[PDB]
């Protein structure tokens, strides 16, 4: 444990990456080439997927666990002094209180639509009613509040209807044109399949790549280094003329609402569980007796009823 | 629990006596009353002379 060795001995000190404020997280992915220049070299999408998994996803995961109240104080104290002492695990859920309040304030009241042309207005209203856009909008606002960014996917369904679905932030991202205009070149979604009864060791991921002209489907897993192999019936045309996924941002920096106070929430957790330990481990009061004396431990039992 | 056991000194003639152990918390402190009244006077005078 001369520190230069701790790598080779796997001693090095575990989860200490920052994640939230790291420079690689929260970056915007850009590509210099056209959509064709990307699609002919599908490997590059593999690099973007890898980068996302290694740097962006961890941040989002942390944020999500805080929204679910699984703050660091719950997990880390698993390593607590598990002796004959009490547990005193505590988590205050501030992240949820905040996100629910801010989102309800912004989108608790449905967005209204006005137009001068009733044909367009009624086509919009029909689509909104079919897709229950009110609930959809509220859910997007909630993702904006916790993760700072949210994604929506639009697809022409098998039943021949235009459908709108939210896409989880931990599994979706967009690669933009490098120009100042930043058109979106291509979007990707990737989900871990797993059985319920086992941990699949390879951690198989199903990857969908959306272009302006169609969807490409591939299969991968983490340990094979994410080599994209086209799935059977890989390609599927779509009738839009631009990439179907859209991204929404909480602010210019795409930073979440409580992202900047997580350290304060942690401090409050630690303080409260410290007082909890003080309460649990010390005796409230005791009758102290000094001096050379004979105390019969049978007589001490009268302590509660002696005058 | 903090347990302090004093050193027992033995005299050449056989006497025994105990050292003086002690323990307690100490904390830093400063003249809050006077420094806040002074800094408040500075701030007040800046605003008074500048209306």
């Amino acid at each position: 444990m001369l520190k230069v060795n701790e790598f080779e001995t796997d001693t090095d000190l575990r989860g200490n990456i920052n994640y939230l404020f790291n420079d690689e997280a929260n970056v915007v992915y850009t590509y210099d080439g056209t959509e064709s220049d990307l699609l002919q070299n599908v490997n590059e999408v593999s690099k973007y997927i890898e980068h996302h998994m290694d740097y962006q996803r961890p941040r989002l995961k942390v944020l999500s666990d805080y929204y679910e109240g699984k703050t660091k104080n719950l997990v880390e104290l698993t390593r607590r002094k598990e002796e004959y002492m009490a547990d005193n695990r505590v988590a205050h859920d501030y992240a949820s209180y905040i996100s629910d309040f801010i989102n309800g304030y912004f989108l608790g009241n449905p967005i209204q639509y006005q137009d001068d042309d009733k044909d367009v207005l009624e086509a919009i209203e029909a689509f909104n009613d079919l897709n229950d856009v009110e609930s959809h909008n509220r859910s997007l606002g909630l993702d904006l509040s916790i993760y700072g960014k949210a994604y929506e996917l639009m697809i022409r369904n098998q039943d021949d209807e235009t459908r709108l679905y939210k896409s989880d932030a931990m599994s979706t991202f967009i690669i933009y044109d490098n120009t100042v205009e930043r058109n979106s070149i291509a979007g990707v979604r990737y989900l871990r399949t797993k059985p319920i009864d086992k941990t699949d060791e390879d951690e198989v991921f199903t990857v969908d790549l959306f272009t302006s002209h169609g969807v490409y489907r591939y299969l991968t897993n983490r340990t094979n280094g994410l080599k994209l192999t086209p799935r059977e019936n890989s390609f599927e045309s779509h009738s839009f003329e631009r990439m179907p996924i859209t991204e929404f941002s909480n602010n210019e920096r795409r930073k979440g609402d409580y992202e900047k106070v997580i350290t304060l929430i942690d401090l409050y957790d630690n303080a409260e569980s410290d007082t909890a330990n003080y309460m649990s481990d010390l005796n409230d009061a005791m009758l102290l007796i000094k001096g050379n004396l004979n105390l019969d431990p049978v007589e001490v039992r009268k302590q509660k009823e002696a005058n | 629990v903090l347990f302090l056991e004093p050193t027992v000194y033995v005299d050449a003639e056989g006497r025994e006596t105990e050292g003086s152990v002690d323990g307690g918390y100490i904390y830093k402190q400063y003249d809050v009353q006077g420094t806040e009244a002074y800094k408040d006077r500075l701030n007040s005078d800046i605003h008074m002379f500048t209306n």
Binding site: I102, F106, Y113, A123, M154, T162, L164 | -
Partner: protein, 102 residues
């Protein structure tokens, strides 16, 4: 966010106390509202494109004219709003007016 532990209330016009206390939160929400509309416009651009490619609407139409109107989820007082709407010349059908009172 309103600090519930150090909080006080004025009169009964809850919305008018709230618009003061949430003034700081409103400033951020207005930027979020700008970016959100920036996204909805793309949603509309896609919808018009698929409608035209299916010829479910005339190719002449344009969706960028839509105006998105946002209202905050502040608390409101139907009794005061009725008095404010019927004073100043409003009209209500009997069946509607009855539908407002439980």
């Amino acid at each position: 966010t309103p600090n519930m532990k150090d909080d006080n209330f004025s009169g009964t016009q809850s919305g008018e106390a709230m618009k003061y206390k949430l003034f700081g939160l409103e400033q951020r929400t207005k930027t979020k509202e700008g970016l959100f509309t920036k996204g909805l416009r793309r949603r509309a651009k896609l919808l018009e494109t698929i409608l035209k490619n299916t010829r479910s609407i005339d190719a002449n139409k344009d969706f960028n004219t839509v105006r998105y109107v946002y209202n905050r989820n502040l608390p409101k007082s139907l009794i005061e709003e009725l008095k404010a709407y019927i004073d100043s010349g409003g009209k209500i059908s009997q069946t509607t007016l009855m539908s407002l009172f439980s």
